[PDB]
Nucleic acid binder design. Structure first.
Ligand code: CLM
Ligand code: MG
Ligand code: MG
Ligand code: MG
Ligand code: MG
Ligand code: MG
Ligand code: MG
Ligand code: MG
Ligand code: MG
Ligand code: MG
Ligand code: MG
Ligand code: MG
Ligand code: MG
Ligand code: MG
Ligand code: MG
Ligand code: MG
Ligand code: MG
Ligand code: MG
Ligand code: MG
Ligand code: MG
Ligand code: MG
Ligand code: MG
Ligand code: MG
Ligand code: MG
Ligand code: MG
Ligand code: MG
Ligand code: MG
Ligand code: MG
Ligand code: ZN
Lengths: 48, 56, 95, 36, 111, 142, 30
RNA sequence: GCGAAACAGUACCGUGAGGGAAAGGUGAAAAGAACCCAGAGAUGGGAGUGAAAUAGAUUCUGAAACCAUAUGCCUACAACG
RNA sequence: UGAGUAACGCUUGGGAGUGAGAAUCUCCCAAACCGAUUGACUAAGGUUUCCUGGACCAGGGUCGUCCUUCCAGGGUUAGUC
């Protein structure tokens, strides 16, 4: 069946990318929180 | 259906009492002496006086 | 110009298959940020014979030593395939 | 002969152990056994 | 400066080996050890490995080498004194060369 | 005088190995080898190797006759297990337990070997009681 | 002869066995 | 005890925000077992080092549940918290 | 404990060879299914899973000398796509 996640290299980068997060106050706050937790994968940009 | 009471370690062994193995009957080859299970060709391919297969 | 864009020559089965038969093809590894024109200029300023043409390869990094206690990634390589004109064959070692 | 290992890392019994996340996202539904 | 240097005669004041005189061949300051020749002889069971031009032979049987010894167990050996003894050293600075020199405290012998 | 051989983390399960080990206990050397060489079981070509190694180190290391060896005790102790996740239906999951056995075979030359083991147990008990009596004598002495 | 004896196995880094260079076998493994 | 004594906000889960583990100790010193035997090998049994090898890398001590072996006693007309 | 129980998720026979060990690996001959497809080219996605040699700790619902698993080396060439 058609499952929920259909992978797309563009949709992912344009929705959860660094530039998408750095365009609104809410995204900046989310990135600040992730830096506080010291996440190695800050966003979906750093896939590798 | 599933056991409403756990089976102890004694009923388990009582059921396994019939799970013992039996020793297969063996005989001696008449040309090389090694033991082979009865009524079967030996390791040399020599059954009785008949050369069945080439030696191992 | 600075000639830091010629890191290391590489010798494989493919390289030696090409490096024989009239036109020679020499394969080096170069700065991944360098362009074809920079590669030709470096060969000019460090060897002296103008390349006939240059081809470039980008080998993506991949996982190595998988399953080992500490796994590691590979290193990004840019390969350059210089081809000198007919009848000329220079040595990579010895100047 | 020529059986040796001079590399700093070399082993044939590679160390590994599989783990379990205990993924048991099980559910259930309704029934025809309703006495109302 | 340091109590024990590379070259001076030294003895052991504790352990199975008592009164073992030797010359320090090498000093590890980080691990506070000291290799003294002729002392602490260990015999590794030398196996055979062949993966290199030198490893093609690598003839090693019961080679006895030197095991490092803690620097605390070592004590400097006196030589200038007619009756040699084990003592502690000072760090006086003589104004002739303004250089620090070790001098024993149970005598007046330099180094 | 018991000679023995061991094998850690044998892939066979203890349940399926004890069935084969019970076919050789108390048997003579040559007959045990003959019985184990023609039994169509997986845990027959592994107990055979252990048995052969045990004979070798009994007649070479410990210096035994070789015509008096009998299988004293062959057992398959429980070894470390390995846990895996088998994917079930409807999103559930179960745990597969890969079982391992620690195999050990022991042969003796003396047909009365149990007596010495009981004797050693008795000696330990006697030393405990002897210690108690000497302590009692010391208590009364003071 | 000698180069035949020195070309069997002893695989070089970037190469394999069999196709060992007919002239270049004295640099890496010297 | 900080979630984190180890390379932990890691492995892993989720599209995402987010959620989030377990895991330490050989020996004073590797002196980490040359060599022999069985085996295809791992490995095991000897040898050797070591005070100790039932301290051997599965590495301080090693409890119970659990699984096997055995000395002694009892048990195949028997209704059993 | 259930219990060595249910299950092991659509495909046969033989000859020769390797190997310590072969219904399962290699070659050959057949045999059986696909054939608007289990055939061929690519987009998306996957990210080395591709080729060669070696290995059989672990994974492969059995076995394994074999693998899309692991180790070492190598592989992607544009003025016109
Ligand atoms: O809940 C049920 N029955 C209950 C069990 O406690 C009871 O037996 C019952 C059965 C029938 C009924 N009725 O018919 O009205 C009412 C209660 C069934 Cl619907 Cl599963
Ligand atoms: Mg029992
Ligand atoms: Mg039964
Ligand atoms: Mg290009
Ligand atoms: Mg599913
Ligand atoms: Mg269970
Ligand atoms: Mg993720
Ligand atoms: Mg031992
Ligand atoms: Mg344990
Ligand atoms: Mg312990
Ligand atoms: Mg009765
Ligand atoms: Mg009656
Ligand atoms: Mg009654
Ligand atoms: Mg009664
Ligand atoms: Mg349970
Ligand atoms: Mg069971
Ligand atoms: Mg049943
Ligand atoms: Mg049934
Ligand atoms: Mg069935
Ligand atoms: Mg199937
Ligand atoms: Mg079938
Ligand atoms: Mg058809
Ligand atoms: Mg198709
Ligand atoms: Mg991979
Ligand atoms: Mg392949
Ligand atoms: Mg292969
Ligand atoms: Mg298997
Ligand atoms: Mg062209
Ligand atoms: Zn015969």
């Amino acid at each position: 069946m058609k499952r929920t996640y259909q992978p797309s290299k563009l949709k992912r980068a344009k929705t959860h990318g660094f530039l998408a997060r750095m365009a609104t106050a809410s995204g900046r706050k989310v990135l600040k929180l992730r830096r506080k937790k010291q996440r190695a994968q800050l966003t979906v940009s750093s896939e590798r | 259906a599933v056991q409403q009471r756990r089976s102890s370690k004694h009923r388990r062994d009582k059921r396994r009492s019939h799970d013992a193995l039996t020793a297969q009957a063996l005989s001696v080859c008449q040309k090389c002496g090694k033991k082979k299970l009865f009524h079967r060709v030996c390791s040399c391919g020599m059954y009785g006086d008949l050369r069945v297969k080439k030696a191992y | 110009d600075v000639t830091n864009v010629l890191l290391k020559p590489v010798l494989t089965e493919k390289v030696y298959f090409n490096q024989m038969g009239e036109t020679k093809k020499y394969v080096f590894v170069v700065n991944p940020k360098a362009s074809k024109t920079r590669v030709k200029l470096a060969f000019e300023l460090v060897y002296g014979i103008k390349p006939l043409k240059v081809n470039t390869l980008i080998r993506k990094p991949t996982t190595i030593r998988g399953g080992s206690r500490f796994p590691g990634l590979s290193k990004l390589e840019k390969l350059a395939v210089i081809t000198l004109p007919k009848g000329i064959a220079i040595s990579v070692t010895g100047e | 002969x020529x059986x040796x290992x001079x590399x700093x890392x070399x082993x044939x019994x590679x160390x590994x152990x599989x783990x379990x996340x205990x993924x048991x996202x099980x559910x259930x539904x309704x029934x025809x056994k309703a006495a109302d | 400066m340091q109590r024990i240097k590379k070259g001076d005669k030294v003895v052991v004041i504790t352990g199975k080996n008592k009164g073992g005189s030797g010359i320090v061949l090498k000093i590890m300051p980080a691990r506070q050890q000291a290799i003294v020749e002729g002392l602490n002889k260990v015999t590794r069971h030398k196996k055979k490995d062949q993966t290199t031009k030198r490893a093609a032979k690598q003839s090693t049987g019961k080679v006895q080498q030197e095991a490092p010894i803690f620097l605390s167990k070592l004590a400097l050996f006196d030589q200038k004194a007619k009756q040699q003894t084990i003592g502690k050293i000072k760090y006086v600075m003589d104004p002739k060369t303004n250089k620090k020199t070790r001098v024993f405290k149970k005598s007046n012998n330099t180094l | 005088m018991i000679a023995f051989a061991k094998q850690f983390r044998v892939r066979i399960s203890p349940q399926k190995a004890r069935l084969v080990c019970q076919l050789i206990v108390g048997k003579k050397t040559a007959d045990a080898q003959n019985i184990l060489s023609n039994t169509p079981k997986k845990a027959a070509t592994l107990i055979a190797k252990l048995l052969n190694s045990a004979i070798a180190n009994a007649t070479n290391n410990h210096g035994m006759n070789g015509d008096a060896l009998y299988v004293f005790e062959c057992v398959a102790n429980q070894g470390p297990s390995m846990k895996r996740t088998i994917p079930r239906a409807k999103g559930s999951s179960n745990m597969i337990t890969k079982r391992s056995s620690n195999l050990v075979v022991k042969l003796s030359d003396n047909p009365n070997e149990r007596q010495e083991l009981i004797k050693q147990q008795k000696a330990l008990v006697k030393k405990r009681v002897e210690g108690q009596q000497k302590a009692k004598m010391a208590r009364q002495k003071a | 002869k000698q180069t035949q004896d020195l070309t069997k196995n002893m695989k070089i880094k970037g190469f394999r066995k069999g196709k060992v260079p007919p002239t270049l076998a004295k640099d890496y493994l010297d």
